[PDB]
Design a protein around this ligand. Structure first.
Ligand code: HEM
Ligand code: HEM
Ligand code: HEM
Ligand code: HEM
Lengths: 141, 146, 141, 146
């Protein structure tokens, strides 16, 4: 559960993200692939060389989805509905990996938004990532 | 891993009791049912749609025996879990693309199947000795990921 | 989400526990401490010795709450509110420990209900226990 | 911990930029904020009522530096983290009763602090160096737990 302060803090931070959502989403995935090498097991069909059109396309897709999630923060379940089925029925990514991706997004954001990334926004984002991951995972079994 | 004399003997004793053939097919079977996402590595296995389908599945059965067969050989080299598994570790990573987290899952499911098979013989202290082995085997298999 | 089939598996299994719930509570505890030494850090005021009254006394409290959770499977958040408050605001037990106890629980169930503990039932009990932990930690932040 | 010569260097290089007290207070406070449950060890500290209160807590500040003081000292021993933290591992377990989970959490908060502090300089490859370092210290503070 995201408090109203939470959503205010998410809506604000993400706003700053704005147009870099795509690029921050690629950097996040490059961050995860590097720190947590096991996440790779899910993209053996990607060229994971830095800058690959694939990682760039993927990061873009991931960000849209987050923004979709920010835009519909009061009804994430319904909004990520399709993503949820995809994750649970096809991709079937172990739920722990979400947590690693969350952490990498949080570091991407920390590094891009010096001004906005206060103790609070930080708290709120993390909760937000926690919620997004819960939703994408909710239809697992 | 490091196990006390008491823990090593708990492990060994109980394991000599285990019929790998069928404890493996159960462990794998149960993995596929409790953590359905693990089903991704076994599309060629036929029908996995129902617990019944998964438990009665012969490829699952065949595979479980194999996995556990290996698991068994590790028990014998408890001292150097890493050396033992590197080849399978490498295979698991490079050709199979199996997230190491699936090793932890199976390990936990193995413990449940043990407790279930042996009931009360599988005591707390026995459980613990067996938790350190599973953890050690999982790290042994995750060891060569890159 | 707990399916009608899950609730039926859960109530059924829990049905077999009966009056040994306290007992299985204590054992589960005992399992946890022994297999995951780190959980002990939350109980430096107890005598965690085998056969300990304290553990015994706590094992029963734990078991009753699950008994209650079961009674109210369609209304866990309400039933477990004071519990969720207590762990969140007073005990502050890290969420990771809930997964550890859940496993020891399962294990104590496996070893006690050979007939009952089917793959399918193993499955619902695991969902149920994930739901409980979800409730109990829902107010941490 | 297994770091290549290049990884040790990114680690030390960037660390030399780090003001310990500052990042100490920051990381500790951020920990208590983001993961409230962590405030449990800290009732004597006074007001922890709000983020502002936490981050402004001189007790938090003082506990923060001591903690990163030790961290900082352990980077000179990247080869024997275990040996370095043994005593502190025991104290945490025996007297403090600190769930080692808190160490994994503090490490992530840390990494986030570094990213906030360093911006661009904290690159993907640097992150990974530091992730290992943080897993390293957490695994080492947890090693003497029984
Ligand atoms: C914050 C959590 C996540 C979000 C917002 C997210 C979102 C998405 C989206 C929007 C897509 C594209 C779906 C489509 O094209 O219809 C996707 C696909 C995918 N995701 Fe997730 N995802 C997340 C977590 C993860 C994690 C943690 C992993 C693995 C570590 C993962 C692995 C995959 C894979 C492998 C694909 C398909 C890749 C391809 O074949 O192009 N996702 N995800
Ligand atoms: C952790 C204990 C494990 C051990 C010791 C182990 C061992 C083995 C061995 C011995 C093989 C044989 C390949 C051959 O016969 O050449 C194998 C293959 C395989 N394993 Fe594992 N395994 C383990 C767990 C897992 C888990 C948890 C999964 C996924 C959930 C997995 C997925 C597979 C797959 C997909 C194959 C290949 C099947 C094929 O050719 O169609 N393994 N494993
Ligand atoms: C299924 C999950 C859990 C349930 C249902 C449960 C339930 C309970 C209940 C009913 C009480 C007693 C309430 C009171 O009398 O004030 C309690 C207290 C407590 N719980 Fe939880 N709990 C769970 C998980 C955990 C975990 C994982 C830990 C730590 C590893 C934990 C640590 C404690 C502590 C330290 C106390 C109070 C100890 C005392 O002062 O006697 N709980 N819990
Ligand atoms: C890198 C991680 C950590 C390091 C290196 C570390 C180091 C230290 C050191 C060097 C001290 C003083 C030891 C002494 O008395 O000789 C200490 C005390 C203590 N630590 Fe840790 N610590 C770490 C993480 C944590 C965390 C995350 C918490 C709580 C969540 C914590 C809780 C405490 C407490 C409560 C004390 C006692 C302070 C006092 O009594 O005044 N530690 N730690």
């Amino acid at each position: 559960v995201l408090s109203p302060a939470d959503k205010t803090n998410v809506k604000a931070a993400w706003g700053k993200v704005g147009a870099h959502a795509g690029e921050y989403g690629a950097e996040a995935l490059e961050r995860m692939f590097l720190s947590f090498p096991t996440t790779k097991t899910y993209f053996p069909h990607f060229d994971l060389s830095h800058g690959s059109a694939q990682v760039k396309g993927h990061g873009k897709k991931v960000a849209d989805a987050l923004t979709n999630a920010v835009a519909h923060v009061d009804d994430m379940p319904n909004a990520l509905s399709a993503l949820s089925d995809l994750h649970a029925h096809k991709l079937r990514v172990d739920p722990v990996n979400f947590k690693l991706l969350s952490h990498c997004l949080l570091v991407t954001l920390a590094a891009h938004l010096p001004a906005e990334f206060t103790p609070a926004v930080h708290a709120s984002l993390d909760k937000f990532l926690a919620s997004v991951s819960t939703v994408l995972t909710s239809k697992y079994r | 891993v490091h196990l006390t004399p008491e823990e090593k003997s708990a492990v060994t004793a109980l394991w000599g009791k285990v019929n790998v053939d069928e404890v493996g097919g159960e462990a794998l079977g149960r993995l596929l049912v409790v953590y359905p996402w693990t089903q991704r590595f076994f599309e060629s296995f036929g029908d996995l749609s129902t617990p019944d389908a998964v438990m009665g599945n012969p490829k699952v059965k065949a595979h479980g025996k194999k996995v556990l067969g290996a698991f068994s050989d590790g028990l014998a080299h408890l001292d150097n879990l890493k050396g033992t598994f590197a080849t399978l570790s490498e295979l698991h990573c490079d050709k199979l693309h199996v997230d190491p987290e699936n090793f932890r899952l199976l390990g936990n499911v193995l413990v449940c199947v043990l407790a279930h098979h042996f009931g009360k013989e599988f005591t707390p202290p026995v459980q613990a000795a067996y938790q350190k082995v599973v953890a050690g085997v999982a790290n042994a298999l995750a060891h060569k990921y890159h």
